[PDB]
Amino acid sequence: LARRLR
Amino acid sequence: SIVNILSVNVLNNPAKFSDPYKFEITFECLEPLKSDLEWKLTYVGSATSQSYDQILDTLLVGPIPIGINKFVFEADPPNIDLLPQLSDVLGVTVILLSCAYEDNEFVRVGYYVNNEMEGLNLQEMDDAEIKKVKVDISKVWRSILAEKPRVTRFNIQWDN
Amino acid sequence: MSIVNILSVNVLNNPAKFSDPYKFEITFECLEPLKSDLEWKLTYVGSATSQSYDQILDTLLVGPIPIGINKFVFEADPPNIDLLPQLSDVLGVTVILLSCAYEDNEFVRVGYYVNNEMEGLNLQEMDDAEIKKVKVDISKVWRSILAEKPRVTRFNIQWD
């Protein structure tokens, strides 16, 4: 699962 | 809906006002999706207007597998720089956890949050005292009422 | 940098518009279990002289990392042009750095030169003043990452 903050 | 939220836990609760939020989220994804899920946490500073809403953080998560998925959404604390007085953080405020797909929100989970400062009893203070009291943000604690979520779901188009 | 080794890096969309998000397809191997996530970052380096013009484009957390081969696509936002003294600063050769850290310690960096051109302009025929003052339509600016010549740097870190 890949998580990117804006 | 392709995506159903199964569980939301606040990992760190109560916490200091300035501590980042940690929401552990479990959801099921029922079919394949082309795009990421976009999660957002919004601090809602006033019950009467949106003028004091703050988008704390927005997290893109994907690609999304079928079945159960679980992750932690860690979000920044609220900014206090713009408030007319610091005591606006005290008392009950709101936090909204939402998810969108391809810019269309499909679920929103709202929580009331109690906020108290070490040394002060707000129930014993009249309104002018609350407005004027010197707030030490490092002594302010939040407590999210996480066993009482308001859950709203909106139909969206997905990949159809 | 013993536990994680990058095997391959491909730029999916190349050349591309300056405003197009970056897509890097990355294969690596994980030789042993890891407690934490890998933190990937892409950095736009706007000046070769100083770091004032560096922009962190995005940071992607990925985990948990299974043993063996892993493949994923790192999509990152384009650079912001709002702060530039002039838009033509985006033109000509700039740099992008792909890096990965574990528990806030960078262990690999892969650097690329990037050519940037605007439809209708030949920068080799222009003097420096002309380049500084020309009206840039960002919608007509294409980047081309020199993806066959990575500069690869590895940093020993502690892992678990």
mmCIF file of C-alpha atoms in Angstrom:
data_model
loop_
_atom_site.group_PDB
_atom_site.id
_atom_site.type_symbol
_atom_site.label_atom_id
_atom_site.label_comp_id
_atom_site.label_asym_id
_atom_site.label_seq_id
_atom_site.Cartn_x
_atom_site.Cartn_y
_atom_site.Cartn_z
ATOM 1 C CA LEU A 1 0.000 0.000 0.000
ATOM 2 C CA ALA A 2 1.510 3.273 -1.016
ATOM 3 C CA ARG A 3 0.630 6.504 0.772
ATOM 4 C CA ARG A 4 1.370 9.998 -0.583
ATOM 5 C CA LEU A 5 0.474 13.203 1.422
ATOM 6 C CA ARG A 6 -0.666 16.153 -0.648
ATOM 7 C CA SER B 1 -20.103 1.234 -3.373
ATOM 8 C CA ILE B 2 -16.852 -0.457 -4.230
ATOM 9 C CA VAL B 3 -15.378 0.720 -0.866
ATOM 10 C CA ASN B 4 -16.822 0.193 2.578
ATOM 11 C CA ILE B 5 -15.154 1.468 5.768
ATOM 12 C CA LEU B 6 -15.165 -1.316 8.377
ATOM 13 C CA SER B 7 -13.408 0.319 11.308
ATOM 14 C CA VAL B 8 -11.871 3.598 12.406
ATOM 15 C CA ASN B 9 -9.677 3.716 15.488
ATOM 16 C CA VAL B 10 -7.965 6.775 16.929
ATOM 17 C CA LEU B 11 -4.614 5.399 18.032
ATOM 18 C CA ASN B 12 -3.584 8.278 20.357
ATOM 19 C CA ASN B 13 -6.510 9.531 22.455
ATOM 20 C CA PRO B 14 -6.606 11.642 24.486
ATOM 21 C CA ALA B 15 -3.647 13.636 23.127
ATOM 22 C CA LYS B 16 -2.138 17.093 23.264
ATOM 23 C CA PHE B 17 -3.844 19.597 20.939
ATOM 24 C CA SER B 18 -0.565 19.880 18.965
ATOM 25 C CA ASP B 19 0.002 16.145 18.596
ATOM 26 C CA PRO B 20 -0.551 14.773 15.044
ATOM 27 C CA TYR B 21 -3.732 12.736 14.621
ATOM 28 C CA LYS B 22 -3.400 9.014 14.011
ATOM 29 C CA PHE B 23 -6.459 7.277 12.528
ATOM 30 C CA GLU B 24 -6.168 3.539 11.900
ATOM 31 C CA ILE B 25 -8.577 2.711 9.140
ATOM 32 C CA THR B 26 -9.769 -0.675 7.933
ATOM 33 C CA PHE B 27 -11.887 -0.905 4.775
ATOM 34 C CA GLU B 28 -12.950 -3.435 2.213
ATOM 35 C CA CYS B 29 -12.550 -2.909 -1.495
ATOM 36 C CA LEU B 30 -15.187 -5.026 -3.352
ATOM 37 C CA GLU B 31 -13.966 -4.571 -6.973
ATOM 38 C CA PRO B 32 -10.806 -3.384 -8.831
ATOM 39 C CA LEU B 33 -10.289 0.426 -9.031
ATOM 40 C CA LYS B 34 -8.214 2.383 -11.612
ATOM 41 C CA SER B 35 -7.339 5.192 -9.207
ATOM 42 C CA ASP B 36 -6.135 6.006 -5.702
ATOM 43 C CA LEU B 37 -8.408 6.733 -2.730
ATOM 44 C CA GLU B 38 -8.083 10.280 -1.440
ATOM 45 C CA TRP B 39 -8.475 10.563 2.330
ATOM 46 C CA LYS B 40 -8.797 13.926 4.114
ATOM 47 C CA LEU B 41 -9.020 15.137 7.717
ATOM 48 C CA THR B 42 -10.731 18.468 8.343
ATOM 49 C CA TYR B 43 -10.758 20.382 11.568
ATOM 50 C CA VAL B 44 -14.030 22.181 12.100
ATOM 51 C CA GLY B 45 -13.424 25.084 14.399
ATOM 52 C CA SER B 46 -16.951 26.649 14.635
ATOM 53 C CA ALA B 47 -20.464 25.054 14.716
ATOM 54 C CA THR B 48 -22.116 28.004 12.897
ATOM 55 C CA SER B 49 -19.871 28.656 9.805
ATOM 56 C CA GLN B 50 -17.267 26.948 7.588
ATOM 57 C CA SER B 51 -15.058 29.953 7.866
ATOM 58 C CA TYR B 52 -12.966 28.200 10.543
ATOM 59 C CA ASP B 53 -12.543 24.827 8.817
ATOM 60 C CA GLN B 54 -8.982 23.661 8.262
ATOM 61 C CA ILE B 55 -7.958 20.911 5.933
ATOM 62 C CA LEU B 56 -5.312 19.274 8.074
ATOM 63 C CA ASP B 57 -3.907 16.828 5.501
ATOM 64 C CA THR B 58 -4.929 14.881 2.415
ATOM 65 C CA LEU B 59 -3.525 11.405 1.720
ATOM 66 C CA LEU B 60 -3.588 9.507 -1.557
ATOM 67 C CA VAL B 61 -3.583 5.777 -1.021
ATOM 68 C CA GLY B 62 -3.231 3.116 -3.707
ATOM 69 C CA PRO B 63 -3.310 1.133 -5.771
ATOM 70 C CA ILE B 64 -6.106 -0.662 -3.869
ATOM 71 C CA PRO B 65 -6.324 -4.503 -3.714
ATOM 72 C CA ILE B 66 -9.558 -6.492 -3.405
ATOM 73 C CA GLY B 67 -10.549 -7.450 0.139
ATOM 74 C CA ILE B 68 -9.504 -6.020 3.494
ATOM 75 C CA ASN B 69 -7.011 -3.087 3.611
ATOM 76 C CA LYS B 70 -5.753 -1.377 6.748
ATOM 77 C CA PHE B 71 -3.600 1.712 7.184
ATOM 78 C CA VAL B 72 -2.764 4.651 9.473
ATOM 79 C CA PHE B 73 -3.616 8.173 8.351
ATOM 80 C CA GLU B 74 -1.329 10.524 10.303
ATOM 81 C CA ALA B 75 -2.412 14.165 9.913
ATOM 82 C CA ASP B 76 -0.973 17.513 11.123
ATOM 83 C CA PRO B 77 -2.590 19.242 14.166
ATOM 84 C CA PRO B 78 -4.619 22.465 13.587
ATOM 85 C CA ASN B 79 -2.918 25.813 12.995
ATOM 86 C CA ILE B 80 -3.600 28.354 15.768
ATOM 87 C CA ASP B 81 -2.040 31.441 14.049
ATOM 88 C CA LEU B 82 -5.214 32.951 12.613
ATOM 89 C CA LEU B 83 -7.656 32.622 15.553
ATOM 90 C CA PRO B 84 -9.119 35.807 17.176
ATOM 91 C CA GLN B 85 -8.306 34.244 20.572
ATOM 92 C CA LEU B 86 -6.674 30.960 21.494
ATOM 93 C CA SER B 87 -9.571 29.890 23.651
ATOM 94 C CA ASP B 88 -11.431 29.145 20.406
ATOM 95 C CA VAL B 89 -9.718 25.698 20.492
ATOM 96 C CA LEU B 90 -11.311 24.902 23.863
ATOM 97 C CA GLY B 91 -14.677 23.237 24.426
ATOM 98 C CA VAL B 92 -16.311 20.993 21.778
ATOM 99 C CA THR B 93 -15.006 21.087 18.235
ATOM 100 C CA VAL B 94 -15.393 18.717 15.273
ATOM 101 C CA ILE B 95 -13.166 16.493 13.172
ATOM 102 C CA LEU B 96 -14.265 15.027 9.809
ATOM 103 C CA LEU B 97 -12.564 12.083 8.205
ATOM 104 C CA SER B 98 -13.556 11.713 4.523
ATOM 105 C CA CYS B 99 -12.651 9.701 1.478
ATOM 106 C CA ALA B 100 -13.088 10.596 -2.183
ATOM 107 C CA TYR B 101 -12.512 8.781 -5.451
ATOM 108 C CA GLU B 102 -11.484 10.813 -8.555
ATOM 109 C CA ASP B 103 -12.431 14.033 -6.689
ATOM 110 C CA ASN B 104 -15.923 12.884 -5.569
ATOM 111 C CA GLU B 105 -16.401 12.363 -1.841
ATOM 112 C CA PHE B 106 -18.141 9.062 -1.077
ATOM 113 C CA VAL B 107 -17.968 8.835 2.753
ATOM 114 C CA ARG B 108 -17.594 11.222 5.654
ATOM 115 C CA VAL B 109 -17.147 10.210 9.298
ATOM 116 C CA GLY B 110 -17.579 13.028 11.796
ATOM 117 C CA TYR B 111 -16.543 13.185 15.426
ATOM 118 C CA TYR B 112 -17.047 15.595 18.286
ATOM 119 C CA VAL B 113 -13.845 16.394 20.178
ATOM 120 C CA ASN B 114 -13.661 17.661 23.742
ATOM 121 C CA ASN B 115 -10.798 20.118 24.463
ATOM 122 C CA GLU B 116 -9.674 21.152 27.887
ATOM 123 C CA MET B 117 -6.744 23.005 29.381
ATOM 124 C CA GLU B 118 -4.913 21.814 32.488
ATOM 125 C CA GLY B 119 -5.950 24.145 35.355
ATOM 126 C CA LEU B 120 -9.226 25.445 33.888
ATOM 127 C CA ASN B 121 -12.804 24.436 34.406
ATOM 128 C CA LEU B 122 -14.767 25.934 31.470
ATOM 129 C CA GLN B 123 -18.154 25.063 33.048
ATOM 130 C CA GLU B 124 -17.373 27.471 35.875
ATOM 131 C CA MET B 125 -16.343 30.377 33.596
ATOM 132 C CA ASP B 126 -18.631 32.922 32.027
ATOM 133 C CA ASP B 127 -18.278 33.801 28.344
ATOM 134 C CA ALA B 128 -16.045 36.823 28.746
ATOM 135 C CA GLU B 129 -13.651 34.811 30.925
ATOM 136 C CA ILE B 130 -13.423 32.091 28.297
ATOM 137 C CA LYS B 131 -12.730 34.687 25.610
ATOM 138 C CA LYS B 132 -9.946 36.391 27.578
ATOM 139 C CA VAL B 133 -8.171 33.567 29.449
ATOM 140 C CA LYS B 134 -4.480 33.095 28.538
ATOM 141 C CA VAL B 135 -4.257 29.739 26.797
ATOM 142 C CA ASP B 136 -1.085 27.653 26.983
ATOM 143 C CA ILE B 137 -1.504 25.386 23.985
ATOM 144 C CA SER B 138 1.023 22.904 25.480
ATOM 145 C CA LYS B 139 -1.483 22.279 28.289
ATOM 146 C CA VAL B 140 -4.443 21.743 26.012
ATOM 147 C CA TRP B 141 -5.695 18.194 25.506
ATOM 148 C CA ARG B 142 -8.091 16.817 22.958
ATOM 149 C CA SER B 143 -10.315 13.864 23.473
ATOM 150 C CA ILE B 144 -12.037 12.556 20.320
ATOM 151 C CA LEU B 145 -15.446 10.988 21.027
ATOM 152 C CA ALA B 146 -14.552 8.076 18.797
ATOM 153 C CA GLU B 147 -17.286 5.627 19.822
ATOM 154 C CA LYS B 148 -19.953 7.977 18.356
ATOM 155 C CA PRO B 149 -19.172 8.599 14.651
ATOM 156 C CA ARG B 150 -21.637 10.377 12.416
ATOM 157 C CA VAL B 151 -21.343 8.494 9.131
ATOM 158 C CA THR B 152 -22.609 9.893 5.820
ATOM 159 C CA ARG B 153 -22.307 8.112 2.465
ATOM 160 C CA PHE B 154 -22.697 9.657 -0.985
ATOM 161 C CA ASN B 155 -23.304 7.681 -4.153
ATOM 162 C CA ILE B 156 -20.571 8.274 -6.739
ATOM 163 C CA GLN B 157 -19.722 6.898 -10.200
ATOM 164 C CA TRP B 158 -16.501 4.881 -9.509
ATOM 165 C CA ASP B 159 -15.132 3.373 -12.729
ATOM 166 C CA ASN B 160 -18.615 2.971 -14.320
ATOM 167 C CA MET C 1 22.982 -0.410 1.981
ATOM 168 C CA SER C 2 22.456 -4.171 2.449
ATOM 169 C CA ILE C 3 18.712 -4.892 3.034
ATOM 170 C CA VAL C 4 17.153 -3.022 0.049
ATOM 171 C CA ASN C 5 18.672 -2.968 -3.412
ATOM 172 C CA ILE C 6 17.199 -1.083 -6.373
ATOM 173 C CA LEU C 7 17.230 -3.307 -9.432
ATOM 174 C CA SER C 8 15.556 -1.119 -12.020
ATOM 175 C CA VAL C 9 14.171 2.399 -12.613
ATOM 176 C CA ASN C 10 12.083 3.269 -15.606
ATOM 177 C CA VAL C 11 10.480 6.578 -16.492
ATOM 178 C CA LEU C 12 7.051 5.642 -17.868
ATOM 179 C CA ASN C 13 6.141 8.955 -19.552
ATOM 180 C CA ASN C 14 9.047 10.560 -21.332
ATOM 181 C CA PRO C 15 9.300 13.114 -22.859
ATOM 182 C CA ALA C 16 6.317 14.788 -21.121
ATOM 183 C CA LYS C 17 4.773 18.167 -20.504
ATOM 184 C CA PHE C 18 6.493 20.172 -17.734
ATOM 185 C CA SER C 19 3.146 20.061 -15.763
ATOM 186 C CA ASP C 20 2.632 16.334 -16.235
ATOM 187 C CA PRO C 21 3.118 14.270 -13.043
ATOM 188 C CA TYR C 22 6.254 12.148 -13.027
ATOM 189 C CA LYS C 23 5.890 8.373 -13.242
ATOM 190 C CA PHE C 24 8.809 6.210 -12.112
ATOM 191 C CA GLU C 25 8.465 2.414 -12.233
ATOM 192 C CA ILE C 26 10.807 0.986 -9.712
ATOM 193 C CA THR C 27 11.895 -2.555 -9.070
ATOM 194 C CA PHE C 28 13.913 -3.463 -6.008
ATOM 195 C CA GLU C 29 14.667 -6.466 -3.860
ATOM 196 C CA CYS C 30 14.166 -6.754 -0.148
ATOM 197 C CA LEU C 31 16.627 -9.344 1.265
ATOM 198 C CA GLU C 32 15.288 -9.384 4.840
ATOM 199 C CA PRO C 33 12.170 -8.342 6.770
ATOM 200 C CA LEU C 34 11.895 -4.686 7.846
ATOM 201 C CA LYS C 35 10.083 -3.121 10.855
ATOM 202 C CA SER C 36 9.122 0.022 9.013
ATOM 203 C CA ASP C 37 8.027 1.560 5.693
ATOM 204 C CA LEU C 38 10.349 2.743 2.914
ATOM 205 C CA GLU C 39 10.087 6.450 2.297
ATOM 206 C CA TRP C 40 10.575 7.438 -1.353
ATOM 207 C CA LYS C 41 11.042 11.055 -2.412
ATOM 208 C CA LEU C 42 11.397 12.992 -5.651
ATOM 209 C CA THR C 43 13.239 16.316 -5.589
ATOM 210 C CA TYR C 44 13.311 18.906 -8.333
ATOM 211 C CA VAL C 45 16.664 20.762 -8.396
ATOM 212 C CA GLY C 46 16.118 24.068 -10.130
ATOM 213 C CA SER C 47 19.645 25.589 -9.865
ATOM 214 C CA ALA C 48 23.002 23.854 -10.240
ATOM 215 C CA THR C 49 24.727 26.560 -8.114
ATOM 216 C CA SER C 50 22.673 26.428 -4.866
ATOM 217 C CA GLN C 51 19.873 24.502 -3.091
ATOM 218 C CA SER C 52 17.572 27.468 -2.655
ATOM 219 C CA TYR C 53 15.655 26.249 -5.737
ATOM 220 C CA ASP C 54 15.086 22.648 -4.646
ATOM 221 C CA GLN C 55 11.471 21.434 -4.405
ATOM 222 C CA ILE C 56 10.426 18.225 -2.792
ATOM 223 C CA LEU C 57 7.786 17.050 -5.282
ATOM 224 C CA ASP C 58 6.279 14.204 -3.270
ATOM 225 C CA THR C 59 7.223 11.633 -0.678
ATOM 226 C CA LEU C 60 5.650 8.157 -0.928
ATOM 227 C CA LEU C 61 5.539 5.714 2.045
ATOM 228 C CA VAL C 62 5.361 2.120 1.057
ATOM 229 C CA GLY C 63 5.029 -0.960 3.213
ATOM 230 C CA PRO C 64 5.024 -3.418 4.579
ATOM 231 C CA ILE C 65 7.847 -4.630 2.417
ATOM 232 C CA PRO C 66 7.719 -8.371 1.553
ATOM 233 C CA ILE C 67 10.939 -10.336 0.939
ATOM 234 C CA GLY C 68 12.206 -10.599 -2.628
ATOM 235 C CA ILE C 69 11.241 -8.588 -5.712
ATOM 236 C CA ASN C 70 8.923 -5.571 -5.313
ATOM 237 C CA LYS C 71 7.678 -3.344 -8.104
ATOM 238 C CA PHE C 72 5.700 -0.166 -7.898
ATOM 239 C CA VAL C 73 5.006 3.086 -9.671
ATOM 240 C CA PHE C 74 6.004 6.324 -7.919
ATOM 241 C CA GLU C 75 3.756 9.115 -9.340
ATOM 242 C CA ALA C 76 4.872 12.569 -8.262
ATOM 243 C CA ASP C 77 3.451 16.063 -8.739
ATOM 244 C CA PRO C 78 5.184 18.489 -11.139
ATOM 245 C CA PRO C 79 7.286 21.453 -9.897
ATOM 246 C CA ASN C 80 5.593 24.658 -8.674
ATOM 247 C CA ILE C 81 6.381 27.692 -10.890
ATOM 248 C CA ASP C 82 4.817 30.330 -8.612
ATOM 249 C CA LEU C 83 8.055 31.346 -6.855
ATOM 250 C CA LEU C 84 10.440 31.707 -9.818
ATOM 251 C CA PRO C 85 11.989 35.109 -10.660
ATOM 252 C CA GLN C 86 11.103 34.244 -14.294
ATOM 253 C CA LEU C 87 9.418 31.332 -15.978
ATOM 254 C CA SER C 88 12.365 30.668 -18.263
ATOM 255 C CA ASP C 89 14.179 29.269 -15.211
ATOM 256 C CA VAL C 90 12.410 25.979 -16.009
ATOM 257 C CA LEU C 91 14.067 25.809 -19.466
ATOM 258 C CA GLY C 92 17.401 24.203 -20.312
ATOM 259 C CA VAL C 93 18.943 21.495 -18.161
ATOM 260 C CA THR C 94 17.642 20.860 -14.661
ATOM 261 C CA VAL C 95 17.956 17.846 -12.286
ATOM 262 C CA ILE C 96 15.590 15.437 -10.573
ATOM 263 C CA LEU C 97 16.683 13.161 -7.694
ATOM 264 C CA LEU C 98 14.866 9.973 -6.755
ATOM 265 C CA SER C 99 15.785 8.792 -3.283
ATOM 266 C CA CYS C 100 14.731 6.311 -0.653
ATOM 267 C CA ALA C 101 15.127 6.461 3.094
ATOM 268 C CA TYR C 102 14.500 4.014 5.931
ATOM 269 C CA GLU C 103 13.548 5.472 9.307
ATOM 270 C CA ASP C 104 14.564 8.950 8.081
ATOM 271 C CA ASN C 105 18.009 7.836 6.874
ATOM 272 C CA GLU C 106 18.594 8.161 3.134
ATOM 273 C CA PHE C 107 20.225 5.005 1.737
ATOM 274 C CA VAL C 108 20.045 5.565 -2.045
ATOM 275 C CA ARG C 109 19.766 8.482 -4.431
ATOM 276 C CA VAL C 110 19.319 8.248 -8.173
ATOM 277 C CA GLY C 111 19.923 11.538 -9.994
ATOM 278 C CA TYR C 112 18.996 12.486 -13.599
ATOM 279 C CA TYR C 113 19.638 15.446 -15.892
ATOM 280 C CA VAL C 114 16.486 16.699 -17.582
ATOM 281 C CA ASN C 115 16.330 18.753 -20.787
ATOM 282 C CA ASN C 116 13.495 21.271 -21.044
ATOM 283 C CA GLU C 117 12.390 22.977 -24.200
ATOM 284 C CA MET C 118 9.510 25.204 -25.309
ATOM 285 C CA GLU C 119 7.648 24.758 -28.563
ATOM 286 C CA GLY C 120 8.775 27.542 -30.916
ATOM 287 C CA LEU C 121 12.039 28.473 -29.193
ATOM 288 C CA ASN C 122 15.582 27.556 -29.928
ATOM 289 C CA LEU C 123 17.579 28.329 -26.754
ATOM 290 C CA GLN C 124 20.972 27.808 -28.510
ATOM 291 C CA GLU C 125 20.228 30.801 -30.748
ATOM 292 C CA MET C 126 19.188 33.060 -27.902
ATOM 293 C CA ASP C 127 21.426 35.243 -25.757
ATOM 294 C CA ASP C 128 21.161 35.252 -21.976
ATOM 295 C CA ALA C 129 19.057 38.353 -21.791
ATOM 296 C CA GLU C 130 16.636 36.931 -24.357
ATOM 297 C CA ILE C 131 16.277 33.724 -22.368
ATOM 298 C CA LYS C 132 15.617 35.688 -19.166
ATOM 299 C CA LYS C 133 12.851 37.833 -20.627
ATOM 300 C CA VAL C 134 11.032 35.534 -23.104
ATOM 301 C CA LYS C 135 7.316 34.866 -22.428
ATOM 302 C CA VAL C 136 7.044 31.201 -21.420
ATOM 303 C CA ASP C 137 3.850 29.329 -22.009
ATOM 304 C CA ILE C 138 4.198 26.460 -19.528
ATOM 305 C CA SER C 139 1.606 24.507 -21.540
ATOM 306 C CA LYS C 140 4.216 24.358 -24.352
ATOM 307 C CA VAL C 141 7.210 23.331 -22.257
ATOM 308 C CA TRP C 142 8.296 19.661 -22.528
ATOM 309 C CA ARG C 143 10.770 17.871 -20.279
ATOM 310 C CA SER C 144 12.876 14.962 -21.371
ATOM 311 C CA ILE C 145 14.571 13.030 -18.564
ATOM 312 C CA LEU C 146 17.925 11.594 -19.520
ATOM 313 C CA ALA C 147 16.938 8.206 -18.091
ATOM 314 C CA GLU C 148 19.792 6.150 -19.561
ATOM 315 C CA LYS C 149 22.458 7.961 -17.490
ATOM 316 C CA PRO C 150 21.445 7.756 -13.783
ATOM 317 C CA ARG C 151 23.932 9.011 -11.194
ATOM 318 C CA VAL C 152 23.524 6.413 -8.392
ATOM 319 C CA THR C 153 24.762 7.072 -4.856
ATOM 320 C CA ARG C 154 24.433 4.643 -1.949
ATOM 321 C CA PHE C 155 24.724 5.496 1.813
ATOM 322 C CA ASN C 156 25.353 2.886 4.491
ATOM 323 C CA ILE C 157 22.599 3.002 7.089
ATOM 324 C CA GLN C 158 21.669 1.012 10.196
ATOM 325 C CA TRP C 159 18.385 -0.692 9.202
ATOM 326 C CA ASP C 160 16.974 -2.699 12.169
#
